[PDB]
Amino acid sequence: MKIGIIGAGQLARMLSLAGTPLGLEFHCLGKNGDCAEEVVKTVTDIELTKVNDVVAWAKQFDVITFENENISHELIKAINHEVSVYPSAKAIAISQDRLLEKSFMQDHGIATAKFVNIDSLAKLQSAVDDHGLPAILKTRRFGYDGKGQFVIRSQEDITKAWDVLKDAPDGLIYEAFVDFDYEVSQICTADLKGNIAFYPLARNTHKQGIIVESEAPFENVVLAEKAQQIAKILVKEFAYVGTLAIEFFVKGDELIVNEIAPRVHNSGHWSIDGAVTSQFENHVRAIAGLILGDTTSRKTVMLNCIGGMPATKDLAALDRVKIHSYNKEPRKGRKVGHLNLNLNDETDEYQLLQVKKLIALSEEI
Amino acid sequence: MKIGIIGAGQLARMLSLAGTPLGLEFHCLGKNGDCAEEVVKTVTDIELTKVNDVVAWAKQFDVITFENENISHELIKAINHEVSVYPSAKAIAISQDRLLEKSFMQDHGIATAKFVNIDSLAKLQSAVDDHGLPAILKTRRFGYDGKGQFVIRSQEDITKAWDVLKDAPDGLIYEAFVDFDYEVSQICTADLKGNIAFYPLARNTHKQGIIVESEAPFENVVLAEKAQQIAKILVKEFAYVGTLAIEFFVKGDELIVNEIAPRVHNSGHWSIDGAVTSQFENHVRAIAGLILGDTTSRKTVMLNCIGGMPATKDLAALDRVKIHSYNKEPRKGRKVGHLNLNLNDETDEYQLLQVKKLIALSEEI
Ligand SMILES: Nc1ncnc2c1ncn2[C@@H]1O[C@H](COP(=O)(O)OP(=O)(O)O)[C@@H](O)[C@H]1O
Ligand SMILES: Nc1ncnc2c1ncn2[C@@H]1O[C@H](COP(=O)(O)OP(=O)(O)O)[C@@H](O)[C@H]1O
Query: Is A2-96's fold the same as A178-365's?
Result: no
Contact between A44 and A70 (Cβ < 8 Å): no
B22 touches chain A (CB under 8 A): yes
Q: Put residue A239 in one of left, alpha, beta given phi > 0 → left and psi -120 to 50 → alpha.
A: left
* Ligand 2 closest atom vs CA B258: 8
Contact between B135 and B155 (Cβ < 8 Å): no
* Ligand 2 closest atom vs CA B211: 25
Residue A242 CA, ligand 2 centroid: distance in Å = 46
Report the residue from B291, B316, B317 with minimal CB separation from A319.
B291
Residue A304 CA, ligand 1 centroid: distance in Å = 17
> For chain A, how far is it from start to end, CA to CA, in angstroms?
40
Q: Which residues of chain A are within 8 Å of residue B289 when distances are taken between CB atoms?
A: 313
Resolution of the model in angstroms: 2.1
User: Could you check whether the bond before residue A330 is cis, i.e. omega within 30 degrees of 0?
Assistant: no
3-class SS of residue A120: coil
Method: X-ray
d(CA B63, CA B76): 12
Question: Sheet containing A149-152: which strands, arranged edge to edge?
Answer: A115-118, A172-176, A135-139, A149-152
Q: What is the 3-state secondary structure (H, E, C) of chain B?
A: CEEEEECCCHHHHHHHHHHHHHCCEEEEECCCCCCCHHHCCEEECCCCCCHHHHHHHHCCCCEEEECCCCCCHHHHHHHHCCCCECCCHHHHHHHCCHHHHHHHHHHCCCCECCEEEECCHHHHHHHHHHHCCCEEEEECCCCCCCCCEEEECCCHHHHHHHHHHCCCCCCEEEEECCCCCEEEEEEEEECCCCCEEECCCEEEEEECCEEEEEEECCCCHHHHHHHHHHHHHHHHHHCCCEEEEEEEEEECCEEEEEEEECCCCHHHCCHHHHECCCHHHHHHHHHCCCCCCCCCECCEEEEEEECCCCCHHHHHCCCCCEEEECCCCCCCCCEEEEEEEECCCHHHHHHHHHHHHHHHHHCCC
Residues A154/A156/A159/A163 CA torsion (nearest 10 deg): -90
Q: Which residues of chain B are within 8 Å of residue A62 when distances are taken between CB atoms?
A: none
Nearest CA to ligand 1 atom 2: A177
d(CA A93, CA A66): 13
Tell which residue, B52, B45, B1, B48, has the closest CA to residue B22: B1
Q: Given this structure, which CATH class describes domain B178-365?
A: alpha beta
List the single best residue of B291, B314, B343 to mutate versus A (max A Cβ within 10 A): B291
Phi, psi of A330 (to 5 degrees): -65, 130
Tell which residue, A225, A206, A126, has the closest CA to residue A174: A126
β partners of residue A216? A300
> For chain B, how far is it from start to end, CA to CA, in angstroms?
40
Q: For residues B88-97, b (16+ Cβ closer than 10 Å) or e, as one string?
A: bbbbbbbbbb
Residue B164 CA, ligand 2 centroid: distance in Å = 19
* Ligand 2 closest atom vs CA B177: 3
Q: Is B32 annotated as a binding residue?
A: no
Output the ligand 2 site: residues, CB below 6 A.
B 113, 136, 143-146, 175, 177-178, 183, 206, 209, 259
Other CB atoms within a 10 A radius of the CB of residue B251 amount to 14
Are residues A319 and B41, on separate chains, in Cβ contact within 8 Å? no
A186 DSSP assignment: E
Task: Considering every ligand atom shown, identify the ligand nearest to the alpha carbon of residue B174 and give its number.
Answer: 2
Phi, psi of B136 (to 5 degrees): -135, 130
Cα A331 versus chain centre, distance: 20
d(CA A154, CA A324): 42
Percentage helix, strand, coil for chain A under 3-state DSSP, each rounded to 5: 35, 30, 40
Are residues A319 and B23, on separate chains, in Cβ contact within 8 Å? no
Residues contacting residue B300 through CB under 8 Å, at least 6 positions apart: B215, B216, B270, B273, B274, B340, B341, B342, B343
Number of residues written out for chain B = 365
Tell which residue, B49, B52, B53, B59, has the closest CA to residue B27: B59
Nearest CA to ligand 1 atom 26: A209
Report the residue from B17, B40, B294 with minimal CB separation from A320.
B294
Residues contacting residue A5 through CB under 8 Å, at least 6 positions apart: A12, A15, A16, A26, A27, A28, A29, A36, A40, A64, A65, A66, A67
d(CA A256, CA A259): 9
B97-177 belongs to which homologous superfamily? ATP-grasp fold, A domain (3.30.1490.20)
A39 touches chain B (CB under 8 A): yes
Q: Given this structure, which CATH class describes domain B2-96?
A: alpha beta
B222 touches chain A (CB under 8 A): no
* Strand intervals (E) in A95-224: 115-118, 135-139, 149-152, 172-176, 182-190, 196-198, 202-207, 210-216
d(CA A110, CA B44): 56
Output the ligand 1 site: residues, CB below 6 A.
A 113, 136, 143-146, 175, 177-178, 183, 206, 209, 259
Tell which residue, A130, A123, A66, has the closest CA to residue A99: A123
Domain positions in chain B are 2-96, 97-177, 178-365
- Burial label, B343 (beta-carbon count in 10 A; 0-12, 13-18, 19+): middle
Are residues B17 and A17, on separate chains, in Cβ contact within 8 Å? yes
Cα A169 versus chain centre, distance: 22
Tell which residue, A223, A228, A210, A132, has the closest CA to residue A181: A223
Report the residue from B317, B322, B342 with minimal CB separation from A291.
B317
d(CA B46, CA B33): 14
Nearest CA to ligand 2 atom 1: B177
Tell me which amino acid residue B344 is.
N
Pocket mutation for ligand 1, best pick of A142, A152, A247, A258 (most atoms within 8 Å of C-beta): A258
Q: For residues A244-278, b (16+ Cβ closer than 10 Å) or e, as one string?
A: bbbbbbbeeeebbbbebbbbbbbbbbbbbbbbbbb
Q: Which residues of chain A are within 8 Å of residue B36 when distances are taken between CB atoms?
A: none
Sort strands B254-261 and B242-251 into parallel, antiparallel or unpaired: antiparallel
Pocket mutation for ligand 2, best pick of B98, B185, B258, B304 (most atoms within 8 Å of C-beta): B258
